[PDB]
Each structure stands twice: as C-alpha cells, then as structure tokens.
Amino acid sequence: VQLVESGGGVVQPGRSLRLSCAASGFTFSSYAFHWVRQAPGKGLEWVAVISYDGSNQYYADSVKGRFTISRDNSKNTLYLQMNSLRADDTAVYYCARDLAIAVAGTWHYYNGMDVWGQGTTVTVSS
Amino acid sequence: EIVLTQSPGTLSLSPGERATLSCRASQSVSSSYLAWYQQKPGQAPRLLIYGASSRATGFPDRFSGSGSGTDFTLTISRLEPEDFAVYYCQQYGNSPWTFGQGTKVEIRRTVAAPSVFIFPPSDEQLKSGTASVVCLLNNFYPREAKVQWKVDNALQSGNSQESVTEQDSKDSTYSLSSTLTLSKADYEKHKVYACEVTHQGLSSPVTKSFNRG
Amino acid sequence: DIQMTQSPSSVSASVGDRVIITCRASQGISSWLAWYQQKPGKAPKVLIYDASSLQSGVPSRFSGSGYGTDFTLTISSLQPEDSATYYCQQAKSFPITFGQGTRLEIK
Amino acid sequence: MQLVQSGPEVKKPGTSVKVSCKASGFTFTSSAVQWVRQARGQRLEWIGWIVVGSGNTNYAQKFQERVTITRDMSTSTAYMELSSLRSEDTAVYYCAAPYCSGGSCFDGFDIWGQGTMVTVSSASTKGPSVFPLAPSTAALGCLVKDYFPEPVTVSWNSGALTSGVHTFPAVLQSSGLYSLSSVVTVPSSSLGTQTYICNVNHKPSNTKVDKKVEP
Amino acid sequence: ITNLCPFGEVFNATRFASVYAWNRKRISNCVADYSVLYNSASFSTFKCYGVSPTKLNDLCFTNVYADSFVIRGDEVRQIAPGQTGKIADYNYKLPDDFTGCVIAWNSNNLDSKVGGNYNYLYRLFRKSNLKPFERDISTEIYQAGSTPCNGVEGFNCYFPLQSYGFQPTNGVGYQPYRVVVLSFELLHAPATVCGP
Ligand SMILES: *[C@@H]1O[C@H](CO)[C@@H](O[C@@H]2O[C@H](CO)[C@@H](O)[C@H](O)[C@H]2NC(C)=O)[C@H](O)[C@H]1NC(C)=O
C-alpha cells in the first residue's frame, strides 16, 4: 500500500490547480477516499470526501463552490480540482483512505483514515 | 481448486459398453462439494450425482460415482440410448467455483462420404455484391475435414467458413458445408473455384467447374 | 457542526511516565472516535479507532476509553519515540472535525 | 419447482442489461442463486452467487468490477446486471438454486432456469436474401444470406416428404449479419419428379419468401 | 413518599443494548410513579396489554421486569401477544397471556451514523421458533443442510447475525426505535412495588 501526490504550484493568484493522488497495491474500487489540508504550522483540517462508487460527494464550508473532487477506477487515480484560489488557502494537502469496519459480512464506511500520502506543498501568493 | 481437468475428451462406442469419465483436479477439494451435470443440445443442464456418490431423483439406475482427494470419476454401467450427451464437473466448496471442460459421448457407425458438391454461381453475382461460392460434404461420423490453401487461382485461404450439423437420431452421421467468397461483382481474375477435400477412403474427389468469363 | 475540544495543549514527561489526554464533544457521538499521532515533519498515523479498539501494529502501551461526551488516551510508559502531536476526530456526521492538538516533549 | 427467466434481448455495445429469475414452488427466503454463462458450442462459465437471506455476494475475478447482483426479497425475484458490453458477451445466461422446504435445504443446485439469449452488436434489422441452387440422383437445396436478428426457419414445399433435410446452423459473418443453408437429396432416381419448392420465414420482420428451385 | 423507584436508569440510559441480547433489570421494594410516563414525554406508542394505562397507580404487584433493546421502525408491531415475523420468531418472543406495557420512541439523533451503525445486530437463520422470554447469544455457523460445517462458512453454512444499517436518511420505516417492555408479576408473594 502506497499513495503518491503531485501538483504543487509556485504562485497561484486566482488560477486553477489540479491535484492527483495515485493508488497502488490494493483493490482501488472497493474503498472511499479523502482529502485533508494542514495550514503552515496550524492544526489539521478537512476539505472533501468521495464515495466508494463515486455517486455521493460532500464538501466543507470554506471549500464548497470552488473545489471539486472526482475519481477514476481505470488508472487507480482520483483528482481534486480547485478554482479561484485565495491567498489564504496555503496548505499541505494529504490523500487519505477510509477505514471500513466489517461486521457480519457487511462493510461500514466513514470510520477514520488509515493510509496517508506524503504531502503536496501548495502555496498561493501574488 | 482453481482448474479442473476432464479426460478423455470424447468417447464413442455402440450401446452397452461401460464408460468411466474422470475429472482429475488440482491441489485438493472436499468431498460432498462436487457434482455432475448433463446437457442435451438445446436444453438446460440437469443435476446428476450431487455428492460424488449421491444420485439425483430423476435419473434411473446404472449411474454410479466415486471420489477421492484428486481423482473423481463417474461410471455408467451401460450405454443405453438417450444417454449420449455432454457431462460437466463442478466444485463449489472453494471460491471461485469452476467447471470442467465437458466430454461428448458419440455413437460408432459407418462412413459414407460420397463427394463434395460444387455449383458455385447463380445468375446474379455481378448483378449483386459479394460473389458467393459453396461446397458441401455429407454422411461422415468422424470429425476429420480438410480444405487446401490455394483452392483455385485466388488462394484466399481465409474466406473459408464451415458449419456442421449434429448427429442424426437414428442414422448417426454429420454434414458439412464450406463457403469462400472473397470479392464482389468486380472480379477480374478470380472467377472460378475448385474445392479439394480428403476424407477416410476414396481420398480427394477433385471438383470441376467452368470459368466465370 | 460538532465542535471538539482537546486539553491540555503542552506537556512533558520521560522514560517510565504515564500521561493522560482529554477530549470533549459538543454532542453525544457514542463510541465513534479516533486518535492520531504526527511527528514534526511526516504524515499522521492512526492509533485508536472505535474509541476503544487499537490499530493492528500499534504497540500495546497505548490505551483509551470513553463513551458519549468524555474520552481519554493513556500512555503507559513514555519511551523516547513518542514526542509528537495527537488529534481527535468525530465520525458521527459531516463535516469531519478534528481537535486542537496536544504537543509532547521529553523531560 | 421453477425458475422462470425473462425473454431474449438484443443490446448494443457499451450499454447495460438486467436479467430476471423468478422463483416459484419453494421457500425462496432461505436459498442461494448462482449465475452461469454459455456461448454457442462452448463450455460453461461461472459468474457469481448471492445468499438470498443475507444478501452477501461473491463474483469471479474477471467479472468483479462489471457485475452487480440484487436481491428483491419481496415477490421472490433475483436480478443481475452487466455493464460495458463487448462483442464477446453474446451468450446464454442461466440461474440455478437448490430446493428448500422449511429450514432444511438441498445439497446441490437442482432447479435450473430456461436461458436468456443475449446478442450484442451493431446493425438494426435486415431481412434475408434467398438464392437458388442447381444439380450437376444428387443433392440440391436453398440458400440464405445476410439477416441480423438470428432466428429463422426453413421449410420445404409445405411440410411434406421429411427427407434428408439438413439445415446448418447460422454463422456470424464478418460484417455482423448471419447466413445458413438448407439442402436435401433427390433419391427418386430421376430429375423430373415431385414439384417440390423452398420456404423461408423471418420473425422480427414481415418478410416471407417462397423461392422455387429445379433446372 | 420517601422512597422512589428508579426509572431514569432504564429510560435515560446511554448504552441501551441490542435486540438479540436484550437486557433485563428487576425492580422491587420501591414506590413507582406511573403518572410521569403515561402523562409525559414523547413516546410514540404506549400500549398496555392486559390492564389499562389509567388506574395503574392503584394495583401493586411483587416484581416488575424491564426489557430494553433497539429495533427498526416497521418492526414495532411484532412486539405483541401473538404475532409472527422475524423478531417475534428468532429474537424476542412475547407470551400470548401478557400483562404489561410496551413503549417506544424514535431515537434517530442518537443511533444514526453517516455510513452505517455497526452495532445493533439482530438474529437470522435459526432452526426453531424460540420460547416466550428466552434469549440466545450463541454465534455458531448455521448448518442449513446435511453436510456438517466445520467452522467455515460457504454453501449451506451462514453466519446467523445481520447488522442493522442505520443512517440519518432512511425514511420513517427504517429509522431506529428504542423499546422498553414492563412485565408485572404477582406470584404468591407479598407485594413490594406498591404505588403512592
Ligand atoms: C429523562 O430526562 C429528562 C430530562 O429533560 C426528563 O424530563 C424532564 O423531567 C423533569 C423532572 O422534573 C421535568 O420537570 C421536565 O419537564 C421534563 N422534561 C424536560 C424537557 O426537561 C425525563 O423525565 C427523564 N426520564 C425519566 C425520568 O424516565
């Protein structure tokens, strides 16, 4: 199991930047995923989520209406578009993966994040 | 189990001969999770013995069954009619479940291959598109056939298509037809044809035709 | 929007010392919680899920329990490989909310 | 004592399809339904199985991210869906289940479905063409060319003489259409004899032919 | 009225047990007040099989048993003298000559999780039909055929429990409900649960 990450940008005043985290070593089509940011020295913050079949999507409050998530099962890769970035969105974004607690043969989702990525340093400026 | 092997591929003899299908398999599989089936043409499979020894209700006597770690088998004590079909294995005690290849029992009879009939054109294959030609074989129970590569001046040993019927319910034989058409009304040097087939006896009855121009 | 509070914010202890960390929820989230640990320059790692279970591979020195509003995480002996920051998380409803974090040291 | 299926379907490449299998005569609540596949002249294949009570499903490795199997406890009907159809999925699909009365169940799959032919390819519909054959006492028959839907019937005269008729199966031509042939003999030891004629009939099109043969 | 009977430890309880492993608490030597349960709260169903809700502060018995568990929404009609289904057959059977009360209220804010609640299982695939006031907590592979199941699931061997999947969007017919059943017993003994 391993997740990679790419897409950091030098100066991003009001541009679109596409981030992608690729999967490896397991069944990509039977898990849900996540995205999580962390300010330059502050706590840990949540930004988005994607369902296991891709039908349902949920966003945060300072993120909805400008960031968009999507997934592809063919390349074992999922993406996250970002539109009209403020200078106040500097962070280090992490790909993640839901814990799935299986009880009596049925899988239950959205219980945590066990596998994490390395981190993408995305910085916005003028 | 992940792959099952059924041997021998085909059997053939007159009614009243004990037959021993064998279904030798991979590493191991539990007993009472293996079953046999039977499928006559144009039908759905029925359930034969369902525990490697326990026989189903519908089928009559003469159907036995054995089993072991890697050597399962099915013995029919007599080849009475209405028992010539295709039989399959299955193991359903280790996912993924799998089937055998299946073995088709035949009937031994006499060969009567008369000739290969050729009558290539109608009136209209320049008053139409693809120029079609057919040759036909008849009355042979063995499954050996041949057509050679050149045929006529146009080699085109890729257009030959053949389809075969099933055995007759009383006069068990087969029949076979071969078609090799190629171009359209725009023929200019590949007019005529000549199928050449060898079969168990009189060898190759060569065929004659006349040019299309 | 469940708000999570985590106290204290900065502690220190060494070798064979036992420490306690509290986490408080604005509602009753039952037994739906998780704890993490992040070293100063690496990705976080989950430690305890379901508010009582322990992730396969985490050493058995850690233990935490709770139900409802109050939760706790206890470390039996603070070995010199446990100087990091720990976070809560609620899984009852969206959006997912974390705690403020708590930084350890070495006495 | 039955697992009646749906009717035949003809789809297009890339679309999806759902097949039904309704149980009757036994307690469907406690059972299990498995699905198989077979082409024309080929061997059986396995797809997956579902527990009717729990709903848990297991699929084959190659059909895993293409097939979903549902339950529909009420009305006692089970379904199966295939996504991203290809030209190699032209086959017949069956459903099987054991016999269960009360808590106890049979030890094998004895109740079987009746089949559901599924054809997936281009083209829409095209009535066939008929050619006459000639002698050279010998053999002689009809000819059929280029019909897509697949089911077709050939008779002779009206129904008479039931001779050595031989109707070969249809073959999927290169373009996508089909073709078959029908032939008999003339054992009467003469060429000028009974006035026998051909006959063709295609179902999913109002097309009927009565082409005559002879020299 | 010095003593008082503790009902807030049966109704206002944090963990509230499951249907196939229901909890029972014996109550005695108190002075119960039934004018705070009938004439209060938000109980959707208050059915008193046997005796009526009124004049319940008059009669007094020897012991009272409280049974608490959680079921689905359209499964609360199966808790009644008689009835047939899947809960009144394998999980909790109630005798045909019953004297007591049935109470249930919609607890959806507390027992619903995004993704699905993995607690609150219920029993499936049993052989017999259980007996009145009998529990079973065994978790053994259900053998549905002649061939024994040597601890491994597969064909004709199934796990006997299914998990309720509770989410905050399921419709009223699938939302969780919390059920409490009181059973009044007068068994040839001096009473200890007499009212005010
Ligand atoms: C469970 O707790 C609630 C707390 O609200 C109790 O309901 C209140 O009980 C007090 C008792 O004097 C009343 O004054 C209030 O009017 C009640 N309602 C509210 C909204 O506060 C309830 O009685 C408890 N359940 C029990 C004891 O079975």
Numbering used by the authors:
A (entry chain D): 2 to 127
B (entry chain L): 1 to 27, 27A, 28 to 212
C (entry chain E): 1 to 107
D (entry chain H): 2 to 52, 52A, 53 to 82, 82A, 82B, 82C, 83 to 100, 100A, ...
E (entry chain A): 332 to 527
Lines quoted from the article behind this entry:
The rapid spread of the severe acute respiratory syndrome coronavirus 2 (SARS-CoV-2) B.1.1.529 (Omicron) variant and its resistance to neutralization by vaccinee and convalescent sera are driving a search for monoclonal antibodies with potent neutralization. To provide insight into effective neutralization, we determined cryo–electron microscopy structures and evaluated receptor binding domain (RBD) antibodies for their ability to bind and neutralize B.1.1.529. Mutations altered 16% of the B.1.1.529 RBD surface, clustered on an RBD ridge overlapping the angiotensin-converting enzyme 2 (ACE2)–binding surface and reduced binding of most antibodies. The RBD is a major target for neutralizing antibodies in both convalescents and vaccinees.
Structure of the RBD with both Fabs bound after local focused refinement is shown to the right in cartoon representation. (C) Docking of RBD-bound VH1-58–derived class I antibody B1-182.1 onto the B.1.1.529 spike structure identified four substitutions with potential steric hindrance. Docking of the RBD-bound B1-182.1 onto the B.1.1.529 structure indicated that the epitopes of these antibodies were bounded by Q493R, S477N, T478K, and E484A, with R493 pressing on one side of the antibody and N477/K478 on the other side of the antibody at the heavy chain–light chain interface. N477/K478 positioned at the junction formed by complementarity-determining region (CDR) H3, CDR L1, and L2 and clashed slightly with a region centered at CDR H3 residue 100C (Kabat numbering). Structural analysis indicated that CDR H3 residue 100C, located at the interface formed between RBD and antibody heavy and light chains, may determine their potency against B.1.1.529 (left). For class III antibodies, only one prototype antibody showed complete loss of B.1.1.529 neutralization. We determined that viral escape was mediated by the G446S amino acid change.
